[PDB]
Amino acid sequence: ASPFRLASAGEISEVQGILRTAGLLGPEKRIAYLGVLDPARGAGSEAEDRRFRVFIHDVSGARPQEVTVSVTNGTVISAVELDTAATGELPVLEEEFEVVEQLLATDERWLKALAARNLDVSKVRVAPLSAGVFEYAEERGRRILRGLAFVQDFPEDSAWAHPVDGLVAYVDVVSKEVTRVIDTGVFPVPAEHGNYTDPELTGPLRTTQKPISITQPEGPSFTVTGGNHIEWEKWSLDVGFDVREGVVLHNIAFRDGDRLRPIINRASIAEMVVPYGDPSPIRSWQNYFDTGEYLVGQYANSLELGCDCLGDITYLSPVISDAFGNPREIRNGICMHEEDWGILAKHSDLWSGINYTRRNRRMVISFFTTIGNYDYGFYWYLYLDGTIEFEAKATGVVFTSAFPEGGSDNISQLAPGLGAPFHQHIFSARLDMAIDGFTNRVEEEDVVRQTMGPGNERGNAFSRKRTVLTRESEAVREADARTGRTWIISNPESKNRLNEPVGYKLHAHNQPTLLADPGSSIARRAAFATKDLWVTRYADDERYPTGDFVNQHSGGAGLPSYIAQDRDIDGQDIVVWHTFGLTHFPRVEDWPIMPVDTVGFKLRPEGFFDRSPVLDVPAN
Amino acid sequence: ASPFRLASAGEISEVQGILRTAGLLGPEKRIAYLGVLDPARGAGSEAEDRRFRVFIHDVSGARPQEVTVSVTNGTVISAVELDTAATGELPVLEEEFEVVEQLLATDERWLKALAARNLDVSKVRVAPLSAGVFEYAEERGRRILRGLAFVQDFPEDSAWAHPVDGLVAYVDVVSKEVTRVIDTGVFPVPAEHGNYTDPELTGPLRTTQKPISITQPEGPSFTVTGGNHIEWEKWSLDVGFDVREGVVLHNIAFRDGDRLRPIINRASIAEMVVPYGDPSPIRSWQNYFDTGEYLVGQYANSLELGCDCLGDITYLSPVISDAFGNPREIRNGICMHEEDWGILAKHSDLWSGINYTRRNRRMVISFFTTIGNYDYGFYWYLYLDGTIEFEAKATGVVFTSAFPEGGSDNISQLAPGLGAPFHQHIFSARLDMAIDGFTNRVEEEDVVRQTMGPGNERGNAFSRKRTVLTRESEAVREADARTGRTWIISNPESKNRLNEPVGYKLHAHNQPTLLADPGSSIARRAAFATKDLWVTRYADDERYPTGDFVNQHSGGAGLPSYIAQDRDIDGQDIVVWHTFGLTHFPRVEDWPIMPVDTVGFKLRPEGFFDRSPVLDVPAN
Ligand code: 11R
Ligand code: 11R
Ligand SMILES: [Cu+2]
Ligand SMILES: [Cu+2]
Ligand code: NA
Ligand code: NA
């Protein structure tokens, strides 16, 4: 019955049928994006209307459309033709991945480049890479992918070991034409293999790891109802999935006594971008918006038990649309489990003689996606004590280049002749806040040092200050780790028993934000990534920090456009957008397959509860 | 046979016998500190000499002594009388804890203060609190403790709920005299109880938590030999224990192929301080050096299976000296276990068709200590991929005060009338580095932004810079989170296969450092805490960032004195001292017993290995 239930195969097939019936999904049409829309504010009273949003591409060269369908009512709500030169190209289609290599394989310029390097065209893989927006006027309004080449010596070879530097091509994937082939000169193609399952490289596998068995003999402590509604240790939420954002959490709330208290209305990773810091023209255009351009949900892995997710696991298998509107299941695409998390609280008291220890646990909701060379795990955690956390785990194979003779200020060496250009992985978490309901505000809290003097004669005092962000113009904030800066989301109309507004505190990792020059294309297209925290007034059409159409789309949309409205955010329905990222100078240890590295953030209750919320946790 | 083995009960009894025989341990003498000394540099060649360092207090008022004993040879190596007014008082003795309350109970001034507040003296607990160094000239050369009062309504009551504000006393614990009683006025003693095992407060305990069973059917993957030598997944180390520092790691090394490669010679938490930020004269003197003044090892908890440490646990039970030189075992005082740590590396490749997933694990070595109201867990982690991490877990009961009518800039409210003064918990990790041996250097590495222009026409480039710290005068460094600042310890004489010096990178959390005014007593006594990173040239007598005797000791010793020597640290035997801490503005959720919060740091290999060190980890 829940309006927040996952899309079913039947709903997707029904959208297909509605579009077909309406004349919007003939044989030349392809679905580039399809997802369920969230219910409107105050929709709980009215009967449900399951609506789906669809981006439809046309392979014959006609203009694409944005369409909203009511699957409940069997109707098209709206359909509008898109001018992609203005509003952006549609996301990259899975079917376009192969096209770059295929077209290049019979292009005389490409073949000349490969022949100059004595490379067999049958062995040359070409990555289908998003193009961005640079100086090439002919690309405006065209669906372009750029191609970088990697040699695969045999079918099971890791092509990433053998980058073909000095060469890049640009391809129109609709007209099926190669627009440009740029050859700046030959570089040696690195020869060492990077085959991490080859015994020659691994050596004898370890026999020293004894089994770790994690079981729950009475099953898990969480329940799943309605397909995706989770209840666990006072927490209540719905686990959604979208082909763009991946796992999306809805209606995160905590049962405090008799009252179900909302905390976050919607939590997602609304964008992620990988900007590269190598000024070589072969890669200086490289910025992968894995979420906005590629759709990370689409490439979610099927996760194997005892391998990807360990313990007593409950899986969800979300359904997405293929290019033709047929449903496709991602079997075991979402993992859900609880795990022990060490000591929760402990005290051994010298006066009362009471010794007290309690254990912590967390609920984990995760997926793993693969975007070419990269593989990312997205993990949401709920803890017994009210803490909410997100963690991204970055692994896969590093994106490679040649390592220049005489070194580089922008590339590190991984193996003889093999380079890894410097880059960042920068995430935007969109948190549609609902601290005890929708009337919320944000304060920036800094530690305040105090001078020795009257009122502080020993020079020991310290304090803090809170500054309310009253309007969107004042709500674009930067980190200040030195002053312990955090941001508190509170409800000014809901007080705890000590007469203080209830709140949650966001604790950032204070990693560097976007490093690119502020006048670059990427600083404009990923403007969100230049600042740690943004707060907007909620609006139904302000979904992504980069806007709806990121592919080959200049600045003009997204967060900078939203905040120009300068709306009241002091005790209103607000959205926090937190930028956080990893700055990666690849190390030799990252090669030939990279150990996981992490980044994230958390929010902790801050006078939300009237005392510790875990006094009722039992011993042992 | 290992010279790094834990002290045995026999060794401690033998030190006692040697001291007795030498005339140094008569009936008026008490042992305030006893610990084994590490072997001298280059001692491996010579036969072993187990030496012990002892601080001996005299209850009759005579001067204390510092003594070094050779237990192997049955000799006193050295014995020197200490002038405590100059070099500092000895650590607080466990037997002195009760003395403050006992002396105050018959003092007319104290009784008058309690009577003004209608408090039964039999119900008033007095915390035995370190005194520091302030304006009281009579305290110089005397062993003083200060007393703050807390009412205990009945034997099992949590006295922390009932602070008696406006009152503090100072006591000479040797002459057994009350030197001062200060009463600045009555405050209401908060009345609500804080009894976290009382059903009235907890309510009905949860019945929703289903068991999590963690077992190892073939036992653990680590071995313990020689009592405390651990081998686990290529790692080699010795687990030491000292009554001051607690768990100390020695000889951390990694077996890379056939070669045992040193990484860290000695790792410890060499100090921890809890400075309070309330300018009230009742607490403005409050700074607890839990390590230096109280000795955190002494109060290590006995850790219960399935409660404190979960899984297949191997315990060590370290032996310490009581006040008379008799051995006392801390049963199950150190936990050792390995645990699963999620995904280690993962890639699903679109060209090779190979799908690869490997799991991570970490070895955990921990203890938990209790210092009055506070309880801290100290955790060291070794990971499969070469990462070394420390984490402190802070819990217990928050130190309380009255909450002032009309609020406070330096105290938060926890319950009606109940306050928690702001404070920090600041740790110093002393890492005696040995990256591939002892010839090491430290570089500070910052991200470098680049301007759009020639050589960077698209404004995408970014880089980094490394600055070698050549001498101790240049080696007192601060965090810069905005520029992604880290510190690399390398061996300039040991290169990896790419001809780059092998190294490890220290990743700090960049939390605020000491907030007190730089002219305060605490800024001088805890000078280490004002800066994030210090590097010294190794010396056998430079053990603690605060010197050997912290109790009632002014500035003059410790790190500022060590670095004045301005020694060469560029390719030498060096020591890194990392300051890291928690700044605590207590929340209502911290009351009546606080959920764990954490802080720490890690070091990751940085061109130490010739490729990923975990290619030989098997599937599943
Ligand atoms: C942004 N950026 C930097 C970047 C950089 C590069 C690329 C890029 O683009 C974005 C790419 C995003 C997509 C990434 C998701 C991961 C894709 C993985 C490939 C999908 C796939 C597609 C096809 N196949 Ru098959 N196969 C066998 C074992 C394991 C497999 C894993 C995956 C297979 C696959 C397997 N197969 C079936 C039977 C016998 C042999 C084989 C082989 C041999 C060698 C390779 C693959 N397979 N297969 C081959 C031919 C036809 C059909 C077929 C099938 C059908 C169903 C299942 C498996 N295979 C972006
Ligand atoms: C820096 N700062 C802010 C600060 C602030 C405040 C203080 C402070 O000082 C530093 C203090 C550092 C020391 C902290 C370490 C923790 C000390 C814990 C107290 C030790 C202790 C000391 C004594 N006893 Ru008992 N006892 C029973 C159960 C559980 C117990 C736990 C601990 C017991 C204890 C227990 N006992 C035995 C038999 C019957 C009843 C009892 C009771 C009842 C009520 C309380 C305690 N006990 N006991 C009582 C009397 C005589 C002997 C005795 C023993 C002997 C052996 C074991 C247990 N007990 C510093
Ligand atoms: Cu990376
Ligand atoms: Cu604290
Ligand atoms: Na909101
Ligand atoms: Na060293």
**Among candidates B146, B366, B402, which has minimal Cα distance to B239?**
B366
| Any ligand 1 atom below 6 A from CB of A299 | yes
C-alpha B82/C-alpha B79 separation (Å) is 10
Q: Do A481 and B484 lie within an 8 Å CB cutoff?
A: no
Residue A338 to chain B, least CA–CA distance (Å): 9
Q: What does DSSP assign to residue B123?
A: G
From residue B565, how far is each of B450, B537, B569 by CA, in Å? 38, 9, 11
Dihedral angle computed from the Cα positions of residues A286, A291, A293 and A296, in that order, rounded to the nearest 10 degrees = 110
Bridge partners, A232 (sequence order): A235
User: ω into residue A592 within 30 of 0, thus cis?
Assistant: yes
Do B431 and B264 meet the contact criterion of CB atoms below 8 Å apart? yes
CATH architecture, domain defined by B1-87: Roll (3.10)
3-state SS class at A90? coil
C-alpha B403/C-alpha A430 separation (Å) is 37
Residue B256 to chain A, least CA–CA distance (Å): 12
Question: Is some CB atom of chain B closer than 8 A to the CB atom of A458?
Answer: yes
3-state SS class at A590? helix
The answer to whether A337 is annotated as binding is: no
Do A577 and A536 meet the contact criterion of CB atoms below 8 Å apart? yes
C-alpha A371/C-alpha A395 separation (Å) is 11
Which ligand 2 atom is nearest residue A353's CA? Answer: 45
Q: Method used for this model?
A: X-ray
CB-CB neighbours of A506 under 10 Å: 23
C-alpha A182/C-alpha A165 separation (Å) is 11
Q: Do A203 and B610 lie within an 8 Å CB cutoff?
A: no
Do A157 and B352 meet the contact criterion of CB atoms below 8 Å apart? yes
Buried b (16+ CB within 10 A) or exposed e, B475-513: bbbebbbbbbbbbbbbbeebebeeeebbbbbbbbbbbbb
User: ω into residue B27 within 30 of 0, thus cis?
Assistant: no
Report the CATH fold assignment for A196-619: Beta-galactosidase; Chain A, domain 5 (2.70.98)
3-state SS class at B74? coil
HEC string of B313-374 equals CEEECCEEECCCCCEEECCCCEEEEEEEEEEEEEEECCCCCCEEEEEEEEEEEEEEEEECCE
Bridge partners, B363 (sequence order): B338, B382
Do B244 and B292 meet the contact criterion of CB atoms below 8 Å apart? yes
Bridge partners, B491 (sequence order): B502
C-alpha A241/C-alpha A228 separation (Å) is 10
The C-alpha angle with vertex A48 and arms to A42 and A52, in degrees rounded to 5, equals 100
| Any ligand 2 atom below 6 A from CB of B129 | yes
**Among candidates B616, B618, B490, which has minimal Cα distance to A592?**
B616
Dihedral angle computed from the Cα positions of residues A181, A183, A189 and A195, in that order, rounded to the nearest 10 degrees = -30
**Among candidates A88, A104, A79, which has minimal Cα distance to A24?**
A79
3-state SS class at B54? strand
Q: What does DSSP assign to residue B305?
A: B
What share of residues in chain A are helix, strand, coil (percent, to 5)?
A: 15, 45, 45
Which residues have a beta carbon within 5 Å of ligand 6, which is an ion?
A: B 432-433, 538, 573-574
Residue A329 to chain B, least CA–CA distance (Å): 18
Buried b (16+ CB within 10 A) or exposed e, A99-108: bbbebbeeee
Given its phi and psi angles, is residue B384 left (phi above 0), alpha (psi -120 to 50 degrees) or beta? alpha
Q: For residue A505, what are its two tokens?
A: 């505190």
Closest residue to atom 28 of ligand 2, CA basis: A353
Do B550 and B418 meet the contact criterion of CB atoms below 8 Å apart? no
Q: Give the contacts of A417 (CB within 8 A, at least 6 positions apart).
A: A188, A190, A191, A402, A403
| Polymer length in residues for chain A | 620
C-alpha A152/C-alpha A158 separation (Å) is 6
Q: Do A215 and B213 lie within an 8 Å CB cutoff?
A: yes
Bridge partners, B216 (sequence order): none
CB-CB neighbours of A570 under 10 Å: 15
Q: For residue A534, what are its two tokens?
A: 């943004």
Of B207, B211, B609, the CB nearest to A216: B211
Report the half-sphere exposure of B368 (CA within 13 A, side-chain side). Answer: 26
Do A240 and A269 meet the contact criterion of CB atoms below 8 Å apart? no
From residue A503, how far is each of A81, A536, A608, B452, B523 by CA, in Å? 44, 18, 5, 42, 33
From residue A429, how far is each of A270, A433, A533, B571 by CA, in Å? 6, 12, 10, 44
The ligand placed nearest to the CA atom of residue A375 is 1
Domain ranges of chain B: 1-87, 94-195, 196-619
Rg of chain B over Cα atoms, rounded to whole angstroms, equals 26
Cα B539 from chain centroid? Answer: 21
Return the residue of A nearest to B150 by Cα: A351
C-alpha B469/C-alpha B482 separation (Å) is 21
Do B55 and B243 meet the contact criterion of CB atoms below 8 Å apart? no
| Residue with the two structure tokens 């829309």 | A37
Do A302 and A308 meet the contact criterion of CB atoms below 8 Å apart? no
| Residue with the two structure tokens 């007209």 | A175
C-alpha A536/C-alpha A542 separation (Å) is 9
The set of catalytic residues of B is 290, 374
Q: For residue A525, what are its two tokens?
A: 């297209």
**Among candidates A503, A451, A524, A448, which has minimal Cα distance to A480?**
A448
Do A468 and A458 meet the contact criterion of CB atoms below 8 Å apart? no
Bridge partners, A466 (sequence order): A445
Q: What are phi and psi of A13, to 5 degrees?
A: -60, -35
- Residue B593: its chain A contacts at CB < 8 A? 345, 347, 356, 612, 615
- Residue A604: its chain B contacts at CB < 8 A? 589
Domain A94-195 has CATH 3.10.450.40: yes
**Among candidates A481, A465, A529, A7, which has minimal Cα distance to A271?**
A529
Which ligand 2 atom is nearest residue B293's CA? Answer: 1
**Among candidates B27, B25, B17, B124, which has minimal Cα distance to B73?**
B17
**Among candidates A223, A221, A161, A218, which has minimal Cα distance to A192?**
A161
Q: Give the contacts of A47 (CB within 8 A, at least 6 positions apart).
A: none
C-alpha B424/C-alpha A431 separation (Å) is 30
B563, containing H or E segment:
helix B559-563
Which ligand 2 atom is nearest residue B156's CA? Answer: 44
| Any ligand 2 atom below 6 A from CB of A354 | no
**Among candidates B54, B56, B91, B85, which has minimal Cα distance to B69?**
B54
C-alpha A533/C-alpha A406 separation (Å) is 40
Given its phi and psi angles, is residue B548 left (phi above 0), alpha (psi -120 to 50 degrees) or beta? alpha
Q: What does DSSP assign to residue A290?
A: I
**Among candidates A71, A74, A73, A29, which has minimal Cα distance to A53?**
A71
Cα B203 from chain centroid? Answer: 36
Q: Do B482 and A512 lie within an 8 Å CB cutoff?
A: yes
C-alpha B123/C-alpha A67 separation (Å) is 74
What secondary structure does DSSP assign to B89-111, as a single string?
BPPPPGGGHHHHHHHHTT-HHHH
The identity of residue A232, as a single letter, is W
From residue A164, how far is each of A110, A116, A185, B524 by CA, in Å? 12, 11, 10, 59
Which ligand 1 atom is nearest residue A288's CA? Answer: 1
Q: What does DSSP assign to residue A92?
A: P
- Residue B521: its chain A contacts at CB < 8 A? 458-459
Of B208, B413, B450, the CB nearest to A221: B208
C-alpha A229/C-alpha B233 separation (Å) is 41
C-alpha A302/C-alpha B350 separation (Å) is 15
Question: Is some CB atom of chain A closer than 8 A to the CB atom of B591?
Answer: yes
Question: Is some CB atom of chain A closer than 8 A to the CB atom of B215?
Answer: yes
3-state SS class at B152? coil
Rg of chain A over Cα atoms, rounded to whole angstroms, equals 26
Q: Do B583 and A447 lie within an 8 Å CB cutoff?
A: yes
A540, containing H or E segment:
none
Mutate to test the pocket of ligand 1, among B350, B354, B357 (most ligand atoms within 8 A of CB): B350
Pairing of β A65-70 and β A75-81 = antiparallel
Q: What are phi and psi of A77, to 5 degrees?
A: -75, -45
Closest residue to atom 50 of ligand 2, CA basis: A353
Q: For residue B285, what are its two tokens?
A: 């003197």
Given its phi and psi angles, is residue A59 left (phi above 0), alpha (psi -120 to 50 degrees) or beta? alpha
C-alpha A295/C-alpha A287 separation (Å) is 14
From residue A355, how far is each of A346, B191, B568 by CA, in Å? 8, 23, 50
What secondary structure does DSSP assign to A436-477, as a single string?
TSS-BEEEEEEEEE--SBTTBTTS--EEEEEEEE-BGGG-EE
Residue A377 to chain B, least CA–CA distance (Å): 9
The C-alpha angle with vertex B23 and arms to B22 and B24, in degrees rounded to 5, equals 95
Active site (annotated) includes residue A290: yes
**Among candidates B14, B7, B6, B5, which has minimal Cα distance to B326?**
B14
Q: For residue B473, what are its two tokens?
A: 């005068």
- Residue A356: its chain B contacts at CB < 8 A? 196-197, 593
CB-CB neighbours of A50 under 10 Å: 19
Bridge partners, B601 (sequence order): B390, B508
The identity of residue B156, as a single letter, is E
CB-CB neighbours of B331 under 10 Å: 11
Do A529 and A478 meet the contact criterion of CB atoms below 8 Å apart? no
Q: Give the contacts of B618 (CB within 8 A, at least 6 positions apart).
A: A205, A206, A207, A209
C-alpha A97/C-alpha A294 separation (Å) is 11
What secondary structure does DSSP assign to B486-546, as a single string?
EEEEEEEEEE-TTS-EEEEEEEE-------S-TTSHHHHHTGGGGSSEEEEE--TT---TT
- Residue A184: its chain B contacts at CB < 8 A? none
Mutate to test the pocket of ligand 1, among A93, A95, A96, A97 (most ligand atoms within 8 A of CB): A97
Question: Is some CB atom of chain B closer than 8 A to the CB atom of A96?
Answer: no
C-alpha A280/C-alpha A148 separation (Å) is 13
C-alpha B520/C-alpha A616 separation (Å) is 43
CB-CB neighbours of B247 under 10 Å: 27
C-alpha A173/C-alpha A130 separation (Å) is 12
Q: What are phi and psi of B119, to 5 degrees?
A: -105, 130
| CATH topology identical between A94-195 and A196-619 | no
Count H helices and E strands in chain A, helices first.
7, 34
- Residue B618: its chain A contacts at CB < 8 A? 205-207, 209
Question: Is some CB atom of chain B closer than 8 A to the CB atom of A342?
Answer: yes
Do B101 and B147 meet the contact criterion of CB atoms below 8 Å apart? yes
Dihedral angle computed from the Cα positions of residues B604, B606, B609 and B614, in that order, rounded to the nearest 10 degrees = 40
